[PDB]
């Protein structure tokens, strides 16, 4: 909109006289020009405004010859950004330009080192300013070593050098060559001294190809602003000399690409400039191939020579230019030349000089530009030649005429929509939507060109994902811009490389089948049938999911009318859908790494069927698909982990739809010889030793529908129970126990609930004996060499316990116990307080759904009304539980409540005292601020003493708790919450805290475990009494360990603690306690420390202690 | 001889290319004119690993420079060391990405993508054996946040066979004020999962609060967190660079370091700490730099290495140490009997020992790590990526350009993921 | 341990009048330690107790020290220092 920083910038221009001594506030200064100076690279015409007074405050600076060297190349930095922002071509308009401030600038210049490289930037920018200078309408004759033979020199000296300051040289040497004072003397000088330096210099050395580099740049400058009847006599002998050169077999990009410059230039200098040398044959030659280049930016350089070129050249001559510039489509090139080409012929009708005689020809050919993508590996390329025809299409626009294009509209508007939605590249798309935009604005000829447009904008063909399910609609609307679209899809995307372009593909065919079934039924799945026999791997799958959404289409749209599914397709078609099956087991295809993809291509086509009511029933069709899921369920662990989710739940799905449509022999019924026989292979492959059989086995049994569970639900719960349950075999079982009560819970959902039914559905026989499998999982704690995988276990626990809970409620509320639900609460309450971050928000979210849950509201919620107020609804979306920060502080005040005290407690213990840091920061954080308010009241802490006391008795030699319990136990004795009770002797709280710390401190041998020991010790000295001497003695046992580093940390402990409690030793006694424990090797060998501990004992009161 | 192609992308990445170059160099023994003139046999034996032999005995880089703005590219080309870099591996455009991640990787930088593989491709096509590329940029950004995705995803299609490593520089609030960081970190962070091997995390936070309490400088600028950078990047590639008993190459490496396939990120460090200007005033020992290495303030990251497991370890000792001396050093911290033990420093280390010492230091070591505390720097930006997600602030430029919300809920959730699995693993049993 | 032991002096910007203390505590020490010990020696509460440490090397300058599970040797913390508490 506006520059906003320029009430600082004037400023920071007003601090450059003080911070130019300083090293570091230059640094900031500039860094903050820089940063102040970068936000508008994209907005560079909204700093005009300022480029007035903004310069004034820089050059002014430099000009005053009382400044130091530091402040003018201060200066000279901030002009060299504000130039790189905005542009030296609309900057240096505003640079002096009085005959009064040349020789002040070469003196400047002149006073300058080029081996300086941090003064890079007055060097770069001091030599742009000499050419402003330059453009005054005087004489150097007149301002008088000469003017001229200075600038000459000084250009020399510059144009060989390896720095930025080298193309400063270039539009400097362009400015003072060109003038009729110096275009009479400099220029001759000049132009024997470009000859010797490139029939010198060679492409080897990094010094040669620089003053190459240079010299191509100045000519190629002077040749473009130089008179043409000036340069004229000398284009010869400079094309001769970069021709002996042999630039193209060169090396170098820059170099070509300079070349190819110079050479246009001197080829536009032979003609006139008007609305041929035999000089002019050898320009083009060096011309075409240059389209041939490997890099894109020398082709992108010879397509404007060839442009310029075409124009200023006759119309025979115009026409050959054209004819051997088709030739680059010849089938024996590659992709860069046809983007060459492209190119060429884009810069030759913008400029209005292709013929209608050329339209059969060009338009024969741009219509194979647009869908270019030939596989030239893993990846396919051509994205370079299709971007190029977007150009060439806008340039119809301004060189045929309607009247020339009408035969041709036909099938550039079409190509033009459908290179502009189905592309993979959103440029290319954007690029065909200014085309299509521009042609219509100018020609107007196009079907419907105004309505195509307004959907179909620059802020619309970006979502690529929306494309295909949006606009290809819309466009196919219209009978101009439906077989075609429909027959691009089929053959190209839907045989395309990519996997998503062959499922988006598939998805926008399912659309437009919509619009168009009698040529989707008749024409496309015909083609789609036959693909399927395509050796090609990403062919088979395409020609599959399009059979698959095209059937889904027409079984929706028949559907409507309650007509059959057969109406739209023939019985040939159906024969087809059939053998599709027989076609794949015969020939193998479910091996190697496509076997993968084949199965889930047929998994989604049998899913389609099935849900689509096709005439299969009764069929071995219907067979050979139950013996592929099954296959499929059975071979599980071959398959990738990167896409083993997809197939286990596409094949649970696929199996539920057939036997929810097929598998079925009247209403409420199914047919008995299948019952007795799925059931049972199911019951008898969950008790597979392969983990993942079980995992794939358990929930295509839970997803079978309710008519077919009838009778066998009894034993199908028996069979998912026994997975449930842990044994000394299935250890590290917990995908395989996840997915058991992922199918319990489908089979509680599916089932519903029904009274007096115990086999049929769930009913109060045997909800008791769910919720006790549900509730016995959830303990779970595992932990294997992977991790802390028994969280996975407890994920699916979760879920199937809420879901359940309101299946219910949603019916027979009556059936929840009191116990039960109070047990379901304190479990979710814990498992929503544990370190986790992504399983602590899922606990939370699922809390909250099963509080807020009022319709009906779920009966047996404990502190129904306290929980509400302290989690209100407002609270749900707006807290964010995965951070600890926005949890703990509203986790942390469930403490207040009895019930929420023990499991909450147990639960924050683990986060308390973990690994993780910033978990443990804020709990602790979170703790103290409840604990401050139950701090006076003696009631409360001692509950809060009881509870931790009993759930440390709970999990005892526990190395999963202990150490987590025992690490915040130190930090709440060093924050001092046990105040109270220091001021009794004796505290039975103390003394069996004590006595469970000696018991889990019995015979530690780990470090860590052993640190916690000793911190928990001697912060338990605070107590008074017989707690206090004990507790002492305890330290003394840890100052003789079996290791230095547990010696060493007891006696940094005991001495912090000498410390921090004044009261615990007499002060007639503490500098020496003191003085032993600071000169006292405690890493040292053990008969030297033996005598320390006795000393140390034998003041501090403590017994000798006894081996 | 095995080739390695480096590239660099957006301001910070080039910065911090260049002064690596330049120490590298400089430790190697060559002069800013390209010649060499060291006093060492060892300095020629693995050059060519990352400089090619041109005609004259000179010796050319291997950088390819890559900048949407043209700033960095002219100070690059004229610094103490621009004359080495080829002059035809720079590519840039004129307006860059405007800190938005949708226009350097769909609507900008892919709009020299194309320039950059040319380039990248013809400079491999001179090597004998390409052995894996390389990438310097910084999470900060579009151009270094969207090229480097880009690139990235464009080279594995044509290079499956390619090591791809990266030093991404995990952006801070305290280094700079923009808010549209978050969002170009998260989606930085997705494409750098999926489609990379190994990642060197370098936070700006870590290196702000050395500068700021270590080095006790005033106002700690870019060039003394550029400085530290580089050199720890010299300390980590001093096996790919020097010879020496353990040969670890780039992909025996990253199987050696990486035994999970999304797991990659280091903790990357370097000791002793110093800064600009003078340099020698202490001499440390092997037990002080062991002692040092394994400090979190010796770290360029915001993390604890002790609170966490440990994956894999490494260290590489740069001086007239032995391995020998080194091995009886090793064998001493892994043990509680042991003296002087610590806790923190595990077992099953892999351990180096080099000949030549860094630049203005006889001795050094560096550390190349991974601790699960490197999740801390993945929930730091989490946070910041979802109070200004349900707001929906800023999210218009993105939804313009062509990105829409499924890219960035996919994102959160591969974040997600990854820190649940990250803490998952942090509980694991040691035997 | 002797080595390892640091002098530092405790200041009072708030209350110039108090006398400025000087003790000698252990490098391998937690901030957190050092919160409760000031908590009982001024008798000021623990949250309400924001510390910061100024080298004598860096005057004019004041690092505070929000994190309490770090030690003070990773603040730099060296012989000679003055640590500021302020309530
Ligand atoms: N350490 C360090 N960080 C830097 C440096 N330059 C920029 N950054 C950080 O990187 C982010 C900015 O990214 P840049 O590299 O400047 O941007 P870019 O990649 O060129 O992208 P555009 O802004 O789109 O042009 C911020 O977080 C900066 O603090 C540098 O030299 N060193
Ligand atoms: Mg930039």
């Given at each position: 909109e506006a520059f906003g920083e320029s009430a600082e910038t004037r400023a920071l221009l007003g601090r450059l006289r003080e911070v130019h001594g300083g090293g570091a506030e230059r640094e900031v200064a500039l860094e903050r020009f820089r940063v102040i100076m970068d936000k508008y690279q994209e907005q560079p015409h909204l700093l005009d405004p300022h480029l007035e007074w903004m310069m004034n405050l820089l050059l002014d600076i430099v000009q005053d010859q009382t400044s130091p060297a530091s402040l003018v190349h201060l200066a000279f930095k901030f002009l060299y950004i504000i130039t790189k922002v905005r542009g030296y071509k609309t900057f240096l308009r505003l640079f002096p330009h009085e005959v009064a401030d040349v020789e002040p600038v070469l003196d400047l210049v002149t006073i300058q080192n080029p081996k300086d490289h941090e003064a890079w930037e007055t060097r770069y920018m001091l030599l742009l300013w000499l050419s402003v200078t330059c453009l005054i309408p005087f004489d150097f004759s007149?301002?008088?070593?000469?003017?001229?033979?200075?600038?000459?020199?000084?250009?020399?000296?510059?144009?060989?050098?390896?720095?930025?300051?080298?193309?400063?040289?270039?539009?400097?040497?362009?400015?003072?060559?060109?003038?009729?004072?110096?275009?009479?003397?400099?220029?001759?000088?000049?132009?024997?001294?470009?000859?010797?330096?490139?029939?010198?210099?060679?492409?080897?050395?990094?010094?040669?190809?620089?003053?190459?580099?240079?010299?191509?740049?100045?000519?190629?400058?002077?040749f473009k602003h130089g008179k043409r009847e000036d340069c004229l006599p000398y284009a010869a002998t400079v094309l001769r000399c970069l021709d002996g050169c042999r630039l193209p077999e060169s090396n170098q990009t820059l170099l070509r690409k300079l070349g190819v410059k110079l050479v246009q230039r001197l080829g536009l200098t032979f003609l006139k400039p008007k609305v041929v040398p035999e000089g002019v044959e050898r320009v083009i030659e060096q011309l075409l191939v240059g389209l041939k280049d490997k890099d894109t930016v020398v082709r992108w350089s010879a397509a404007k020579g060839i442009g310029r070129m075409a124009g200023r050249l006759p119309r025979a001559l115009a026409d050959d230019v054209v004819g051997s510039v088709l030739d680059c489509f010849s089938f024996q090139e590659t992709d860069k030349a046809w983007h060459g080409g492209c190119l060429a012929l884009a810069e030759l009708g913008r400029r209005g000089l292709l013929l209608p005689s050329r339209l059969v020809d060009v338009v024969a050919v741009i219509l194979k530009a647009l869908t270019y993508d030939e596989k030239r590996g893993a990846c396919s390329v051509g994205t370079n030649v299709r971007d190029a025809a977007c150009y060439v299409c806008w340039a119809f626009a301004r060189a045929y005429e309607?009247?020339?294009?009408?035969?041709?509209?036909?099938?550039?508007?079409?190509?033009?929509?459908?290179?502009?939605?189905?592309?993979?590249?959103?440029?290319?798309?954007?690029?065909?939507?200014?085309?299509?935009?521009?042609?219509?604005?100018?020609?107007?000829?196009?079907?419907?060109?105004?309505?195509?447009?307004?959907?179909?904008?620059?802020?619309?063909?970006?979502?690529?994902?929306?494309?295909?399910?949006?606009?290809?609609?819309?466009?196919?609307?219209?009978?101009?811009?439906?077989?075609?679209?429909?027959?691009?899809?089929?053959?190209?995307?839907?045989?395309?490389?990519?996997?998503?372009?062959?499922?988006?593909?598939?998805?926008?065919?399912?659309?437009?089948?919509?619009?168009?079934?009698?040529?989707?039924?008749?024409?496309?799945?015909?083609?789609?049938?036959?693909?399927?026999?395509?050796?090609?791997?990403?062919?088979?799958?395409?020609?599959?999911?399009?059979?698959?959404?095209?059937?889904?289409?027409?079984?929706?749209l028949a559907a409507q009318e309650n007509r059959p599914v057969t109406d739209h397709l023939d019985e040939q078609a159906v024969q087809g859908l059939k053998q599709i099956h027989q076609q794949l087991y015969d020939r193998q295809l479910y091996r190697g790494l496509g076997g993968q993809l084949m199965r889930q291509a047929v998994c989604v086509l049998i899913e389609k069927l099935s849900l689509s009511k096709m005439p299969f029933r009764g069929d071995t069709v219907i067979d050979g698909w139950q013996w592929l899921i099954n296959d499929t369920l059975r071979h599980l662990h071959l398959i990738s982990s990167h896409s083993r989710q997809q197939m286990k739940d596409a094949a649970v799905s696929a199996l539920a739809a057939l036997c929810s449509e097929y598998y079925m022999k009247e209403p409420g019924e199914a047919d008995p010889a299948i019952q007795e026989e799925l059931i049972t292979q199911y019951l008898a492959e969950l008790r597979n030793p392969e983990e993942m059989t079980r995992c794939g086995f358990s929930l295509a049994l839970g997803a079978l529908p309710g008519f077919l569970l009838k009778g066998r639900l009894q034993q199908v719960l028996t069979g998912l129970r026994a997975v449930t349950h842990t044994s000394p075999e299935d250890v590290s079982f917990a995908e395989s126990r996840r997915d058991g009560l992922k199918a319990i819970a489908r089979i509680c959902q599916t089932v519903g609930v029904k009274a007096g039914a115990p086999d049929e559905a769930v009913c109060g026989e045997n909800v008791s004996q769910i919720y006790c499998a549900l509730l016995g999982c959830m303990d779970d704690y595992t932990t294997d060499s992977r991790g802390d995988v028994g969280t996975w276990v407890r994920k699916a626990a979760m879920t199937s316990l809420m879901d359940l809970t309101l299946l219910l409620a949603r019916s027979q509320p009556?059936?929840?116990?009191?116990?039960?639900?109070?047990?379901?609460?304190?479990?979710?309450?814990?498992?929503?307080?544990?370190?986790?971050?992504?399983?602590?928000?899922?606990?939370?979210?699922?809390?909250?759904?099963?509080?807020?849950?009022?319709?009906?509201?779920?009966?047996?919620?404990?502190?129904?009304?306290?929980?509400?107020?302290?989690?209100?609804?407002?609270?749900?979306?707006?807290?964010?539980?995965?951070?600890?920060?926005?949890?703990?502080?509203?986790?942390?005040?469930?403490?207040?409540?009895?019930?929420?005290?023990?499991?909450?407690?147990?639960?924050?213990?683990?986060?308390?005292?973990?690994?993780?840091?910033?978990?443990?920061?804020?709990?602790?954080?979170?703790?103290?601020?409840?604990?401050?308010?139950?701090?006076?009241?003696?009631?409360?802490?001692?509950?809060?003493?009881?509870?931790?006391?009993?759930?440390?008795?709970?999990?005892?030699?526990?190395?999963?708790?202990?150490?987590?319990?025992?690490?915040?136990?130190?930090?709440?004795?060093?924050?001092?919450?046990?105040?109270?009770?220091?001021?009794?002797?004796?505290?039975?709280?103390?003394?069996?805290?004590?006595?469970?710390?000696?018991?889990?401190?019995?015979?530690?041998?780990?470090?860590?475990?052993?640190?916690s020991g000793i911190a928990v010790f001697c912060e338990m000295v605070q107590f008074p009494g017989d707690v206090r001497r004990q507790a002492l003695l305890q330290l003394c046992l840890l100052l003789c360990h079996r290791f230095p580093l547990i010696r060493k940390t007891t006696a940094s402990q005991v001495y912090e603690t000498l410390l921090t409690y004044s009261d615990v030793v007499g002060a007639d006694v503490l500098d020496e306690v003191v003085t032993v424990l600071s000169d006292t090797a405690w890493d040292a060998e053990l008969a030297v420390v033996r005598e320390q501990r006795n000393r140390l004992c034998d003041l501090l009161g403590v017994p000798r202690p006894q081996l | 001889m095995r080739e390695i192609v480096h590239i660099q992308a957006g301001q910070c990445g080039n910065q911090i290319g260049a002064k690596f170059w330049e120490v590298i160099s400089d430790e190697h023994g060559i002069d800013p004119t390209g010649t060499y003139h060291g006093d060492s046999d060892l300095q020629l034996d693995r050059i060519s690993v990352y400089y090619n032999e041109a005609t004259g005995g000179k010796y050319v880089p291997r950088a390819i420079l890559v900048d949407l703005e043209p700033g960095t590219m002219d100070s690059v080309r004229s610094g103490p060391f621009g004359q080495i870099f080829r002059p035809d591996n720079?590519?840039?455009?004129?307006?860059?990405?405007?800190?938005?991640?949708?226009?350097?990787?769909?609507?900008?930088?892919?709009?020299?993508?194309?320039?950059?593989?040319?380039?990248?491709?013809?400079?491999?096509?001179?090597?004998?054996?390409?052995?894996?590329?390389?990438?310097?940029?910084?999470?900060?950004?579009?151009?270094?946040?969207?090229?480097?995705?880009?690139?990235?995803?464009?080279?594995?299609?044509?290079?499956?066979?390619?090591?791809?490593?990266?030093?991404?520089?995990?952006?801070?609030?305290?280094?700079?004020?923009?808010?549209?960081?978050?969002?170009?970190?998260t989606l930085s962070v997705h494409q750098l999962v999926e489609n990379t091997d190994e990642t060197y995390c370098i936070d700006n936070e870590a290196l702000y609060d050395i500068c700021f309490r270590t080095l006790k400088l005033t106002t700690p600028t870019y060039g003394d967190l550029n400085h530290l950078v580089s050199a720890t990047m010299s300390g980590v590639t001093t096996c790919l660079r020097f010879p020496g008993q353990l040969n670890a190459d780039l992909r025996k490496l990253a199987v050696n370091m990486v035994p999970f396939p999304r797991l990659h990120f280091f903790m990357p460090g370097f000791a002793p700490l110093t800064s600009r200007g003078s340099q020698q005033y202490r001499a440390l020992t092997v037990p002080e730099l062991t002692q040092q290495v394994?400090?979190?303030?010796?770290?360029?990251?915001?993390?604890?290495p002790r609170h966490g497991r440990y994956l894999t370890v490494a260290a590489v000792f740069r001086g007239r140490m032995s391995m020998k001396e080194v091995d009886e050093q090793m064998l001493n911290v892994q043990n509680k009997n042991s003296s002087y033990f610590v806790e923190w420093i595990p077992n099953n280390v892999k351990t180096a020992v080099c000949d030549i010492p860094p630049r203005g230091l006889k001795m050094a070591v560096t550390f190349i790590g991974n601790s699960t505390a490197i999740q801390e720097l993945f929930k730091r930006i989490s946070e910041q990526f979802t109070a200004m997600f349900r707001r929906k602030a800023f999210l218009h430029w993105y939804t313009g350009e062509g990105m829409d919300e499924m890219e960035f809920t996919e994102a959160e959730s591969n974040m997600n993921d990854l820190v649940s699995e990250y803490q998952q693993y942090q509980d694991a049993t040691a035997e | 341990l002797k080595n390892q032991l640091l002098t530092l002096k405790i200041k009072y910007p708030h209350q110039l009048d108090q006398k400025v203390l000087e003790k000698q505590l252990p490098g391998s020490m937690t901030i957190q330690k050092v919160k409760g010990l000031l908590s009982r020696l001024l008798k000021v509460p623990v949250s309400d107790l924001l510390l910061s440490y100024e080298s004598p090397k860096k005057p004019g300058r004041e690092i505070e020290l929000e994190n309490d599970l770090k030690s003070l040797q990773f603040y730099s913390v060296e012989n000679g220092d003055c640590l500021l508490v302020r309530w």
């Open positions: 007149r301002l008088d070593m000469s003017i001229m033979d200075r600038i000459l020199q000084i250009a020399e000296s510059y144009l060989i050098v390896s720095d930025k300051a080298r193309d400063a040289a270039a539009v400097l040497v362009s400015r003072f060559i060109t003038r009729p004072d110096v275009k009479q003397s400099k220029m001759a000088e000049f132009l024997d001294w470009s000859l010797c330096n490139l029939a010198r210099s060679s492409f080897q050395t990094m010094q040669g190809v620089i003053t190459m580099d240079g010299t191509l740049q100045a000519l190629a400058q002077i309607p009247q020339e294009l009408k035969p041709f509209v036909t099938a550039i508007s079409s190509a033009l929509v459908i290179a502009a939605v189905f592309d993979r590249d959103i440029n290319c798309r954007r690029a065909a939507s200014a085309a299509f935009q521009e042609n219509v604005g100018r020609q107007g000829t196009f079907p419907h060109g105004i309505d195509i447009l307004t959907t179909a904008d620059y802020f619309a063909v970006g979502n690529r994902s929306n494309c295909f399910l949006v606009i290809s609609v819309f466009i196919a609307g219209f009978p101009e811009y439906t077989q075609p679209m429909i027959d691009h899809l089929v053959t190209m995307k839907i045989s395309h490389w990519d996997g998503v372009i062959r499922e988006l593909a598939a998805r926008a065919l399912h659309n437009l089948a919509q619009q168009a079934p009698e040529f989707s039924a008749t024409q496309v799945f015909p083609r789609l049938l036959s693909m399927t026999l395509s050796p090609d791997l990403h062919m088979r799958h395409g020609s599959i999911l399009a059979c698959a959404e095209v059937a889904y289409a027409l079984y929706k009556e059936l929840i116990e009191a116990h039960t639900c109070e047990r379901i609460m304190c479990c979710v309450a814990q498992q929503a307080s544990e370190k986790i971050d992504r399983f602590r928000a899922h606990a939370a979210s699922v809390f909250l759904t099963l509080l807020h849950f009022d319709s009906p509201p779920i009966p047996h919620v404990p502190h129904r009304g306290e929980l509400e107020k302290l989690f209100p609804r407002s609270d749900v979306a707006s807290v964010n539980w995965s951070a600890p920060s926005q949890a703990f502080p509203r986790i942390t005040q469930l403490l207040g409540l009895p019930t929420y005290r023990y499991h909450v407690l147990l639960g924050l213990v683990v986060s308390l005292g973990g690994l993780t840091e910033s978990t443990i920061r804020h709990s602790t954080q979170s703790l103290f601020e409840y604990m401050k308010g139950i701090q006076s009241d003696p009631q409360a802490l001692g509950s809060f003493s009881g509870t931790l006391l009993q759930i440390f008795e709970d999990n005892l030699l526990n190395e999963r708790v202990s150490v987590p319990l025992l690490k915040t136990l130190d930090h709440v004795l060093t924050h001092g919450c046990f105040d109270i009770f220091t001021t009794e002797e004796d505290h039975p709280f103390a003394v069996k805290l004590l006595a469970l710390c000696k018991k889990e401190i019995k015979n530690s041998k780990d470090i860590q475990k052993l640190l | 720079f590519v840039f455009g004129q307006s860059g990405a405007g800190n938005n991640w949708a226009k350097g990787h769909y609507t900008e930088g892919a709009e020299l993508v194309d320039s950059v593989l040319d380039v990248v491709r013809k400079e491999a096509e001179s090597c004998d054996c390409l052995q894996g590329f390389q990438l310097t940029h910084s999470l900060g950004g579009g151009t270094g946040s969207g090229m480097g995705t880009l690139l990235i995803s464009k080279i594995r299609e044509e290079y499956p066979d390619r090591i791809m490593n990266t030093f991404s520089v995990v952006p801070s609030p305290k280094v700079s004020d923009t808010v549209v960081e978050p969002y170009n970190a394994f400090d979190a303030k010796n770290m360029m990251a915001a993390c604890d | -």
